[PDB]
Every structure is written in structure tokens, then in C-alpha cells.
Amino acid sequence: DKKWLGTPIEEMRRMPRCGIRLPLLRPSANHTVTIRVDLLRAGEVPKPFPTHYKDLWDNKHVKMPCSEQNLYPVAGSRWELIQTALLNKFTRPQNLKDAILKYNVAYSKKWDFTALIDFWDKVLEEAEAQHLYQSILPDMVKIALCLPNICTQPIPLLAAAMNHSITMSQEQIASLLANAFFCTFPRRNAKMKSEYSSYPDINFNRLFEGRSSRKPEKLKTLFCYFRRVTAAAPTGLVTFTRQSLEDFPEWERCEKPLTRLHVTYEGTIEENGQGMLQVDFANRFVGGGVTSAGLVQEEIRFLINPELIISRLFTEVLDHNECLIITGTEQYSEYTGYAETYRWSRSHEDGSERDDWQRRCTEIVAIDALHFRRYLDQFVPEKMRRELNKAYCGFLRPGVSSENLSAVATGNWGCGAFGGDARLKALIQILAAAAAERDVVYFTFGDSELMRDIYSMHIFLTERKLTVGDVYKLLLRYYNEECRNCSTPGPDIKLYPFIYHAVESC
Ligand SMILES: Nc1ncnc2c1ncn2[C@@H]1O[C@H](COP(=O)(O)OP(=O)(O)OC[C@@H]2C[C@@H](O)CN2)[C@@H](O)[C@H]1O
């Protein structure tokens, strides 16, 4: 045999149908809202609040390109320079390189534009190139230069240990991302920077470097988005929430029972996870290498739903106890392949319903696993506890009862690029979801043996009525008996065989 095992997917909970009704949208101490809630209507472009541009240039807010404090030593206005540079007509790729470098002179040797030049000159056909420089690029410039009429309210940084939300319009995000494309955000470039060293890259200069064969596919994917959002203004909202928990369960003592499992070797988190909490296998610097050379699970999601990318403008590097939750991003592209075989396939028309805040009914959580360079390192209790607490923070929704929480749509978190063991991580996610009172929908991404192994272990543990704490104690025993005093690189016996023996022996 079967393509899926466990509980039928029809019997799992989904949004917004399992959704609480939303409370009224309102600005508060822990929620920044950048549009007029009183004027928010389905099918209408949201109105910025406030009506006129207000600037903050300080250690707690985004440094906007259009700030009067964005100055260049000649002090002149850098925003005036950006406007003059970008309002020239482009007919050849050198023109675009030269424009970006007019307000980035310190990087005129360091930033390579080979990928941009090759895309324009050596990938596109003539009519496609013409469309790019006659239509798409000038439309992008115009939405970028409208920034102070669109993003009128200062955007707070979602800094370390903040529990805070930002809700902004898809139109505001389009203007911001056009700016990132033209690399206009100040103080976000120097490799020896201080203020923003703990923030991800936002400006898109590394998208334009080198000769990776995947750069044309990343550019096709982003130009699909920019072509659609400059042609017809998008009408919905997107919320970005930083969440930080203080109190974690005492896992060894947790008496909660396991929840339900559906596990399948067909399908993906993004297509088969509708109405479910969709996991992003993140970097602690959210978005990973999306605007540089990365092209695995996180980067692909950030390309096909590009509104995710703007999280990099204001989300500080995640600590152990933190996650980011993004609600309302839209899917603009379809893809084939993965990593070095990734291709843009076509435009996607998102058919998601919107909630009462005009957000697409798509909820994504970024949780970063640890990057293990040795196999045995992940079985150390400290490290197991770390992964449990991370996943718990991602799954937990303080205030909300269990019957209003959708299933988690997840899979082989930490077990590709980050070197984790899928059988351990599967159990870690099962326990975290149990403590958060959510069911699990687990995609094994073509591994049919792994599907049968996860199913068999879950139903073994469930039938014996083992608690979260019972299971965690078995993890601690595997560590003590097979890993702690182990000389060799791999242990003598595997986790699942150990568990079956320990329980059946008792
Ligand atoms: N779309 C997908 N749906 C379900 N599973 C997927 C999907 N895409 C990839 N996978 C599976 O998930 C595994 C792990 O994906 P990776 O992206 O390598 O994740 P992980 O090891 O946590 O690496 C984290 C870093 C940090 C990110 O910025 C970039 N990659 C892959 O080896 C596949 O088996």
C-alpha cells in the first residue's frame, strides 16, 4: 503493497474548517498591523496605515531604503540616487548591473553578476529577453520606488526572545521584495557588519553570481512571481509570528498518550498538506541559501511561495527555544525535480480560500534541526531534548484547545543536508506532536521501507499504551547501552530493533 499506512488521511483535522473563528484583527503591543483593518474587504487592495510615510532609523526597526537617514558620503540622499539609477531604460544586462552598483559602490569588485548576464544573454530567447527589459524590469522598478507610499509604517525587527506578530499586505511584500531584488536595503551587505550579523541576507546580489545551472531556474521562478504581482496587485494579507517558549515539558514524566499517524511514501508537504501545519526544514537563518546557492526543501518552498523570503528582512537568527510561523503566503509556481535537478515548470494559480483576515489558508512553521557531522552525536540526551523542544515550540499554539488544531504535515526533518537519522527524528516528531495534542501526517518522500518502519513502530507503541515519557526513557536507554560507551562510528544495533527488544523483554 500500500502507498500509505495508518489512519486514513480523511479522518485528520484541516483548516480553516477546524479553525476557531478569528478574533478581530487589531494592532496591539505584540501585533504590528500595517494596513487599515476598518477598510479591509475581500477583493480590494488594502490601504496602508498610516496614510503618510513615517520613518524610524534605530536599532529596533527595519532600516528602510527610502529613509532621509539613508545617506551616502560624497552626505547625499541615497534614496534620490536609487531613483536616478533605476529609472534609466535597460536594453542589455550590463545596464542593470551598472544601475545596482551606483548605490553599492563599495561592492563594485566583490559582487559578481555572471548568472544575471548569462540568464539574459545566453538562456532567454530574444522575445523573452525583450519582455524582461521592456516590461518586467521597469514594472519592478516602479513598485520598488513606490515603497514610501506603500510601506508607510515602521516594521519592527522580530528580534531574539520577542513574542510578536507582523501582519502586512501582499502588496507591501511585493514592494519590499522588488527592493531586495535591486539590492537597496542599507546596512545588510558588509561581511564585517555588526547590527545585522545575526540576521539573514535580504538583498539578492548572490542570486546574480557564478555559473550554477540552477540560477536560471531560480530566476525563472522569481520572475514568474514578479510578473504576476506587478501586473495585478494582490489583495490578501500575510502574518509573520516569532514564538519563544520558556517552559518545556519534563519529557521523562510526560503521561500524555501518542496521537494518530498517517504515513506515506507518495506526495509532498506543500501539495498534500492542505489545511495542515506545514513544516519548513529551516536554517536557523530562515530561508537558508534561497537567494544564493541553496536548493533543497526550505529554499524550494521559499521560491514557489516567495512572500516567505521577506521573513529574512526582519527575523533574527532562531535560538533553540524559538520558531517562526507564517500564515497566508501564496503559491505562484510549480516545480519539477529537487536540488541539482530542480526546474521551474509553470505558473501556479493558488485556489486556497482566505480566512477572515484575507490570509490564504496556508500555515507554515520554520523549525531548524541541528546539523550533525557525526552519526552518534544526535543520540546524546541533551541533543534529543533539544530536537524535541524545537519541534514542540513549532507545534504548540498557546491558548488553543486540541480539537481546534490541525494535523502536522511533516517528514524527514533534519535528515538530508543536516545528517539526522529519519527513524529517530520521526519518533522525536511523534512525541512532540503528542505533547502538543496534534496528529501527524508524515511524508517519507519516496522511501517505502521507511514508511513501513515508522508505521510498525507507531502502532507497536500505541497498542501497548506507552506514554510520551515511556518512549523518551527508551531513547535514554538506547543512548546509555549502545552509544555512550561506543568506540566505533555506528552502534552495534539500531534504535527500532533496540526498542522492540526492550519492550517485548520487559
Ligand atoms: N517537499 C517535500 N515534502 C516532503 N519531504 C521532502 C520534501 N522535500 C525534501 N523532502 C525530504 O526531506 C529530507 C530533508 O530535506 P532537507 O532540505 O535536506 O532538510 P534538512 O536536512 O533539515 O536541511 C536543512 C538545511 C537548512 C535549509 O536552509 C536548507 N537545508 C530530504 O532529504 C527529503 O527526503
XYZ file of C-alpha atoms and ligand atoms in Angstrom:
540
model
C 1.597 -3.372 -1.029
C 0.000 0.000 0.000
C 1.154 3.659 -0.697
C 0.055 4.889 2.723
C -0.319 3.271 6.171
C -2.103 4.163 9.405
C -5.123 6.469 9.905
C -6.950 7.435 6.652
C -5.990 10.931 5.658
C -9.753 11.836 5.521
C -10.004 11.320 9.298
C -7.286 14.023 10.070
C -8.089 17.710 11.031
C -7.663 20.607 8.480
C -8.007 24.488 8.267
C -9.758 26.746 8.204
C -12.664 24.224 8.835
C -11.092 23.030 12.161
C -10.281 26.825 12.744
C -11.558 28.783 15.646
C -13.264 31.875 14.326
C -10.603 34.559 14.277
C -10.837 37.446 16.748
C -10.978 40.878 15.141
C -7.665 41.938 13.602
C -6.220 44.827 15.635
C -2.820 46.464 16.306
C -1.531 45.891 19.833
C 1.700 45.829 21.787
C 2.524 42.360 20.399
C 0.930 42.681 16.910
C 2.044 45.193 14.242
C -0.652 45.703 11.565
C 0.449 47.837 8.564
C -2.949 48.290 6.898
C -6.361 49.828 7.648
C -8.368 46.991 9.326
C -11.569 49.133 9.188
C -11.232 49.199 5.318
C -10.155 45.571 4.767
C -12.501 43.998 2.187
C -12.319 40.862 0.096
C -11.180 41.598 -3.464
C -9.879 45.118 -2.580
C -6.224 46.233 -2.324
C -5.594 47.074 1.416
C -4.943 50.712 2.334
C -1.680 51.431 4.199
C -1.867 52.725 7.765
C -0.716 55.379 8.346
C -1.653 57.369 5.229
C 1.720 59.271 5.050
C 5.251 57.707 5.400
C 6.628 57.682 8.961
C 10.341 56.805 9.426
C 12.279 55.144 12.236
C 16.024 54.662 11.815
C 17.036 52.849 15.012
C 18.149 49.513 16.493
C 14.592 48.120 16.775
C 13.180 48.636 13.234
C 13.979 47.820 9.619
C 16.289 50.481 8.095
C 14.265 51.421 5.051
C 15.938 52.463 1.762
C 13.612 55.474 1.493
C 14.715 56.872 4.931
C 16.046 60.501 4.964
C 18.779 58.995 7.188
C 19.891 56.652 4.349
C 22.934 58.795 3.437
C 25.982 58.291 1.203
C 29.385 60.034 1.740
C 30.096 62.115 -1.374
C 26.381 63.284 2.796
C 23.785 62.936 -0.005
C 20.405 61.169 -0.162
C 20.820 57.517 -1.139
C 17.071 57.212 -1.973
C 17.453 60.044 -4.574
C 20.424 58.108 -6.083
C 18.434 54.846 -6.182
C 15.621 56.643 -8.033
C 18.006 58.173 -10.648
C 19.875 54.871 -11.111
C 16.782 52.597 -11.613
C 14.744 54.963 -13.837
C 17.162 54.523 -16.754
C 15.951 52.182 -19.556
C 17.678 48.764 -19.672
C 18.494 47.208 -23.029
C 21.474 44.985 -22.046
C 22.355 43.165 -18.756
C 25.385 45.465 -18.081
C 22.875 48.294 -17.747
C 21.155 46.591 -14.764
C 24.487 45.689 -13.130
C 25.680 49.293 -13.513
C 22.404 50.651 -12.010
C 22.562 48.437 -8.875
C 26.269 49.350 -8.357
C 25.599 53.145 -8.464
C 24.251 52.956 -4.846
C 26.554 49.984 -3.919
C 29.995 51.339 -4.973
C 31.900 49.563 -2.155
C 30.759 46.223 -3.764
C 31.643 47.044 -7.421
C 34.527 44.484 -7.274
C 33.031 41.993 -4.799
C 29.613 41.359 -6.446
C 29.673 39.057 -9.483
C 26.719 39.330 -11.953
C 27.728 36.366 -14.253
C 24.428 34.485 -13.588
C 22.270 37.553 -14.430
C 24.253 38.273 -17.574
C 24.108 34.578 -18.675
C 20.371 34.304 -17.925
C 19.572 37.414 -20.002
C 22.067 36.835 -22.833
C 22.558 33.035 -23.017
C 19.332 31.381 -21.618
C 16.429 33.653 -22.765
C 15.333 33.804 -26.408
C 15.229 37.268 -27.938
C 11.423 37.856 -27.349
C 11.769 36.665 -23.720
C 14.765 38.969 -23.078
C 12.768 41.865 -24.645
C 9.819 41.134 -22.370
C 12.183 41.191 -19.407
C 13.795 44.567 -20.042
C 10.785 46.341 -21.703
C 8.044 45.139 -19.269
C 9.075 43.090 -16.216
C 12.147 45.053 -15.028
C 10.553 48.558 -15.455
C 7.369 47.313 -13.618
C 9.600 46.014 -10.779
C 11.388 49.363 -10.581
C 8.120 51.238 -10.317
C 6.740 49.079 -7.442
C 10.135 49.312 -5.656
C 10.175 53.146 -5.996
C 6.561 53.340 -4.602
C 7.925 51.940 -1.248
C 7.278 55.073 0.917
C 3.632 55.307 -0.344
C 3.068 51.516 0.247
C 5.118 50.691 3.460
C 4.158 53.776 5.480
C 4.575 52.233 8.989
C 7.954 51.265 10.508
C 8.469 47.456 10.602
C 9.787 46.182 13.989
C 12.550 43.624 13.959
C 11.399 40.270 15.229
C 14.411 40.103 17.496
C 15.699 37.303 19.825
C 13.161 36.293 22.532
C 10.398 38.502 21.158
C 6.851 37.050 21.040
C 5.442 39.300 18.342
C 3.472 39.310 15.088
C 3.574 41.452 11.935
C 0.573 41.390 9.530
C 1.158 43.233 6.215
C -0.369 43.162 2.749
C 0.854 41.029 -0.128
C 1.225 44.409 -1.992
C 3.589 45.710 0.747
C 5.593 42.462 0.480
C 5.853 42.860 -3.368
C 7.292 46.386 -2.994
C 9.796 45.194 -0.333
C 10.917 42.160 -2.416
C 11.425 44.398 -5.540
C 13.742 46.486 -3.372
C 15.629 43.308 -2.242
C 15.996 42.310 -5.931
C 17.606 45.758 -6.721
C 19.691 45.318 -3.538
C 18.581 48.664 -1.949
C 18.382 47.667 1.740
C 21.139 49.568 3.660
C 23.483 48.002 6.267
C 22.693 44.478 5.007
C 25.803 43.859 2.831
C 29.118 44.114 4.776
C 30.589 40.754 5.770
C 32.117 42.509 8.849
C 28.723 44.002 9.881
C 27.582 44.157 13.445
C 23.958 45.202 13.792
C 22.629 42.725 11.260
C 25.263 39.949 11.518
C 22.616 37.918 13.399
C 20.075 38.408 10.524
C 19.845 36.504 7.208
C 20.829 38.041 3.884
C 17.946 40.009 2.287
C 19.419 41.805 -0.787
C 19.509 39.436 -3.824
C 23.143 40.067 -5.072
C 24.239 36.370 -4.629
C 21.363 35.287 -6.967
C 23.311 37.082 -9.729
C 26.731 35.409 -9.133
C 28.537 32.389 -10.663
C 27.555 29.743 -13.244
C 25.402 27.204 -11.365
C 22.960 25.627 -13.918
C 20.185 26.148 -11.287
C 20.448 30.000 -11.315
C 18.287 30.271 -14.493
C 15.674 28.084 -12.719
C 15.751 30.267 -9.569
C 15.403 33.434 -11.745
C 12.555 31.911 -13.802
C 10.798 31.095 -10.526
C 11.201 34.630 -9.078
C 10.371 36.439 -12.372
C 7.103 34.342 -12.521
C 6.174 35.907 -9.114
C 7.295 39.457 -10.017
C 5.468 39.325 -13.390
C 2.183 38.316 -11.608
C 2.330 40.829 -8.661
C 3.343 43.903 -10.776
C 0.579 43.181 -13.347
C -2.365 42.751 -10.942
C -1.948 43.960 -7.313
C -2.508 41.053 -4.856
C -5.290 41.691 -2.306
C -4.572 39.477 0.764
C -2.534 39.745 3.966
C 0.321 37.661 5.439
C 1.218 37.289 9.157
C 4.757 36.595 10.474
C 4.928 35.450 14.133
C 8.059 34.866 16.211
C 7.342 32.420 19.030
C 9.584 31.745 22.028
C 8.691 29.292 24.807
C 10.052 29.434 28.354
C 8.643 26.224 29.882
C 9.271 22.925 28.129
C 7.796 19.574 29.245
C 9.713 17.309 31.610
C 9.704 14.654 28.867
C 10.639 11.695 31.112
C 7.494 12.389 33.238
C 5.017 13.206 30.450
C 1.921 10.931 30.788
C 0.281 12.033 27.528
C -0.592 9.243 25.054
C 0.626 9.177 21.413
C -1.721 10.689 18.777
C -2.644 9.428 15.291
C -0.277 8.843 12.344
C -0.777 8.739 8.602
C 2.490 7.915 6.837
C 3.047 7.735 3.078
C 5.892 7.472 0.590
C 3.867 9.421 -2.076
C 3.068 13.158 -2.024
C 4.683 16.280 -0.534
C 4.186 18.616 2.378
C 3.211 21.537 0.078
C 0.729 19.759 -2.208
C -0.795 17.059 0.096
C -0.724 19.124 3.366
C -3.792 21.340 2.639
C -5.301 22.788 5.836
C -2.443 21.327 7.946
C 0.506 22.846 9.777
C 3.215 22.559 7.062
C 6.815 22.222 8.313
C 9.744 24.126 6.708
C 13.026 22.237 7.439
C 14.779 25.511 8.152
C 18.201 27.017 8.736
C 18.377 28.996 11.971
C 18.937 31.914 9.494
C 15.472 31.445 7.929
C 15.311 30.774 4.195
C 18.808 29.214 4.090
C 20.503 29.827 0.698
C 17.332 30.802 -1.151
C 18.956 33.908 -2.703
C 22.401 32.258 -3.004
C 23.192 28.587 -3.939
C 20.759 26.502 -1.753
C 18.005 24.456 -3.456
C 16.631 21.807 -1.058
C 13.364 21.658 0.943
C 13.424 25.143 2.534
C 14.773 27.034 -0.495
C 12.297 25.435 -2.915
C 9.328 26.411 -0.662
C 10.710 29.995 -0.415
C 10.966 30.193 -4.295
C 7.482 28.857 -5.044
C 5.899 30.928 -2.226
C 8.194 33.995 -2.447
C 6.365 36.043 0.181
C 8.279 33.743 2.639
C 11.519 35.471 1.543
C 10.599 38.762 3.222
C 10.876 36.997 6.616
C 14.660 37.484 6.072
C 14.258 41.304 6.263
C 13.164 41.281 9.942
C 13.636 37.746 11.524
C 16.715 37.439 13.791
C 18.554 34.051 13.827
C 16.423 31.487 15.748
C 17.602 30.322 19.156
C 16.959 26.747 20.464
C 13.597 27.653 22.006
C 12.216 29.704 19.033
C 10.335 29.269 15.758
C 8.712 31.383 13.009
C 5.099 30.862 11.949
C 3.935 32.309 8.584
C 0.257 32.363 7.610
C -1.176 33.448 4.247
C 1.691 33.030 1.758
C 0.518 32.182 -1.760
C 1.970 29.617 -4.221
C 2.957 31.335 -7.536
C 4.947 28.492 -9.261
C 5.108 24.738 -9.800
C 8.428 22.874 -9.986
C 9.874 19.501 -11.004
C 12.968 17.789 -9.588
C 14.995 18.643 -6.489
C 18.404 20.166 -5.776
C 20.584 19.898 -8.902
C 17.572 18.621 -10.988
C 15.180 21.429 -9.802
C 13.294 23.130 -12.698
C 10.589 25.818 -12.868
C 7.645 24.042 -14.563
C 4.866 26.693 -14.842
C 2.794 29.466 -13.203
C 0.505 28.267 -10.374
C -2.946 29.810 -9.725
C -3.490 29.475 -5.950
C -7.077 28.234 -5.257
C -6.735 28.364 -1.413
C -9.647 30.042 0.375
C -8.895 33.123 2.539
C -9.649 33.468 6.237
C -11.455 36.367 7.956
C -8.210 38.436 7.815
C -7.909 37.854 3.981
C -4.982 35.446 4.518
C -4.603 32.368 2.257
C -5.418 29.277 4.399
C -1.768 28.045 4.391
C 0.193 27.910 7.672
C 3.933 27.191 7.538
C 6.364 26.839 10.502
C 10.151 27.209 10.225
C 11.965 24.941 12.648
C 15.690 24.330 12.272
C 17.049 20.915 13.221
C 20.644 20.517 14.328
C 23.309 19.847 11.704
C 25.056 16.634 12.746
C 28.515 15.897 11.285
C 28.813 12.541 13.145
C 26.030 9.957 13.287
C 26.216 9.149 17.043
C 26.130 12.832 18.118
C 22.285 13.007 17.699
C 21.607 10.290 20.336
C 23.169 12.339 23.185
C 20.231 13.181 25.567
C 20.967 16.930 25.509
C 20.661 16.823 21.668
C 17.478 14.620 21.682
C 15.874 17.036 24.221
C 16.923 19.986 22.005
C 15.147 18.488 18.918
C 12.038 17.569 20.984
C 11.788 21.133 22.404
C 12.346 22.719 18.982
C 9.603 20.635 17.389
C 7.306 21.225 20.384
C 7.748 25.003 20.136
C 6.847 24.710 16.423
C 3.703 22.651 17.076
C 2.393 24.344 20.267
C -0.322 27.088 19.977
C -0.775 28.571 23.496
C -4.499 29.326 24.151
C -5.892 26.923 21.501
C -7.566 23.610 22.509
C -6.657 20.324 20.833
C -9.900 19.961 18.864
C -9.069 23.257 17.032
C -5.512 22.170 15.980
C -4.921 20.712 12.523
C -2.566 17.765 11.905
C 1.183 18.483 11.366
C 2.307 17.889 7.800
C 5.988 16.896 8.103
C 8.593 14.413 7.005
C 12.373 13.712 7.064
C 13.228 16.942 9.058
C 16.984 17.333 9.620
C 17.738 14.133 7.719
C 19.016 15.372 4.351
C 21.522 18.161 4.372
C 21.643 18.141 8.227
C 22.682 14.434 8.534
C 19.995 13.269 11.017
C 18.599 9.744 11.294
C 14.979 9.656 9.947
C 13.854 6.803 12.276
C 14.934 8.765 15.409
C 13.636 12.090 14.080
C 10.296 10.508 13.176
C 9.871 9.393 16.784
C 11.036 12.788 18.104
C 8.322 14.445 15.974
C 5.685 11.885 17.065
C 6.478 12.676 20.736
C 6.491 16.470 20.217
C 3.138 16.345 18.400
C 1.697 14.138 21.176
C 2.710 16.665 23.839
C 1.163 19.482 21.648
C -2.020 17.305 21.185
C -1.787 17.167 17.359
C -1.936 14.275 14.893
C 0.945 13.640 12.430
C 0.859 13.322 8.637
C 4.377 12.089 7.651
C 5.635 12.212 4.047
C 8.713 9.921 3.511
C 9.486 11.412 0.039
C 9.696 8.111 -1.890
C 11.047 5.822 0.929
C 8.535 2.962 1.138
C 10.661 0.927 3.611
C 10.880 3.969 5.959
C 7.057 4.320 5.722
C 6.539 0.701 6.830
C 9.140 1.051 9.633
C 7.552 4.265 11.057
C 4.031 2.755 10.811
C 5.087 -0.526 12.532
C 6.853 1.253 15.410
C 3.963 3.734 15.990
C 1.275 1.049 16.075
C 3.500 -1.157 18.354
C 3.893 1.710 20.864
C 0.184 2.750 20.564
C -1.165 -0.779 21.116
C 0.998 -1.097 24.290
C -0.319 2.296 25.500
C 3.213 3.667 26.035
C 3.228 7.356 27.065
C 5.497 10.162 25.788
C 7.597 9.595 28.918
C 7.792 5.830 28.478
C 9.112 6.333 24.915
C 11.617 9.057 25.863
C 13.026 6.733 28.595
C 13.633 4.088 25.918
C 15.585 6.719 23.873
C 17.727 7.397 27.008
C 18.347 3.596 27.400
C 19.415 3.242 23.727
C 21.881 6.047 24.307
C 23.249 4.506 27.555
C 23.538 0.902 26.222
C 24.565 1.388 22.517
C 26.029 4.981 22.013
C 27.665 6.414 25.217
C 30.473 3.860 25.556
C 30.645 3.092 21.776
C 34.220 3.148 20.230
C 33.106 2.695 16.578
C 31.284 5.296 14.363
C 27.996 3.336 14.140
C 26.401 1.497 17.158
C 26.101 -2.353 17.351
C 22.303 -2.387 16.958
C 19.793 0.146 15.511
C 17.184 2.212 17.514
C 13.991 0.440 16.382
C 15.362 -3.137 16.975
C 16.527 -1.981 20.423
C 13.062 -0.573 21.326
C 11.195 -3.686 20.167
C 13.583 -5.892 22.236
C 13.418 -3.725 25.395
C 9.610 -3.598 25.384
C 8.989 -7.264 24.376
C 11.606 -8.434 27.006
C 10.089 -6.446 29.914
N 8.614 18.782 -0.432
C 8.983 17.796 0.428
N 7.997 17.171 1.108
C 8.359 16.143 1.971
N 9.704 15.807 2.129
C 10.639 16.431 1.406
C 10.297 17.422 0.556
N 11.471 17.872 0.036
C 12.501 17.166 0.522
N 11.974 16.267 1.394
C 12.654 15.279 2.210
O 13.184 15.843 3.427
C 14.567 15.499 3.514
C 15.302 16.633 4.254
O 15.248 17.869 3.490
P 16.487 18.903 3.700
O 16.101 20.145 2.965
O 17.739 18.268 3.276
O 16.404 19.249 5.233
P 17.417 19.318 6.436
O 18.291 18.088 6.442
O 16.760 19.742 7.667
O 18.440 20.501 5.981
C 18.210 21.820 6.471
C 19.010 22.810 5.572
C 18.784 24.251 6.035
C 17.980 24.756 4.899
O 18.103 26.185 4.780
C 18.480 24.093 3.679
N 18.631 22.685 4.151
C 15.038 15.306 2.091
O 16.235 14.504 2.085
C 13.835 14.558 1.507
O 13.844 13.130 1.918
